[PDB]
Amino acid sequence: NCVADYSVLYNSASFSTFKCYGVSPTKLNDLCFTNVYADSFVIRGDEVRQ
Amino acid sequence: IAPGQTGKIADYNYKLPDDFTGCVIAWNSNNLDSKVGGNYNYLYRLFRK
């Protein structure tokens, strides 16, 4: 129940990786969702591949 | 630097065709382009409308 501006997060030069499956990282503003969930946790760098 | 790839260079400074039929060749330059205290002669573009 909100407006999700995903251009700010993508353009910010702070993320080590931004890899999207199912959706394209650029064509994200013209789509909308019933809900979006953010699963947040800390891992070891070498575990990103898993 | 690859066809079908995105990022701040792929979109702003070097975009490849998605049907590219070539080769990507690379080697490190730590003993040639780098300079002590930072070699500030290589420019990039992080913003574009």
Curated annotation (Swiss-Prot), chain A:
Changing residue 12 to L: In strain: Omicron/BA.1. Residues 44-46 are annotated as: Integrin-binding motif. Binds to host ACE2. RBD also interacts with the N-linked glycan on 'Asn-90' of ACE2. Cleavage of S generates a polybasic C-terminal sequence on S1 that binds to host Neuropilin-1 (NRP1) and Neuropilin-2 (NRP2) receptors. Interacts with host integrin alpha-5/beta-1 (ITGA5:ITGB1) and with ACE2 in complex with integrin alpha-5/beta-1 (ITGA5:ITGB1). May interact via cytoplasmic c-terminus with M protein. May interact (via N-terminus) with host bilirubin and biliverdin, thereby preventing antibody binding to the SARS-CoV-2 spike NTD via an allosteric mechanism. It comes from the Viruses. Attaches the virion to the cell membrane by interacting with host receptor, initiating the infection. The major receptor is host ACE2. When S2/S2' has been cleaved, binding to the receptor triggers direct fusion at the cell membrane. When S2/S2' has not been cleaved, binding to the receptor results in internalization of the virus by endocytosis using host TFRC and GRM2 and leading to fusion of the virion membrane with the host endosomal membrane. Alternatively, may use NRP1/NRP2 and integrin as entry receptors. The chain holds residues 360 to 409 of 1273 of the full protein. Changing residue 12 to F: In strain: Omicron/BA.2, Omicron/BA.2.12.1, Omicron/BA.2.75, Omicron/BA.4, Omicron/BA.5, Omicron/BQ.1.1, Omicron/XBB.1.5, Omicron/EG.5.1. The gene is S. Changing residue 49 to S: In strain: Omicron/BA.2, Omicron/BA.2.12.1, Omicron/BA.2.75, Omicron/BA.4, Omicron/BA.5, Omicron/BQ.1.1, Omicron/XBB.1.5, Omicron/EG.5.1. This is Spike protein S1.
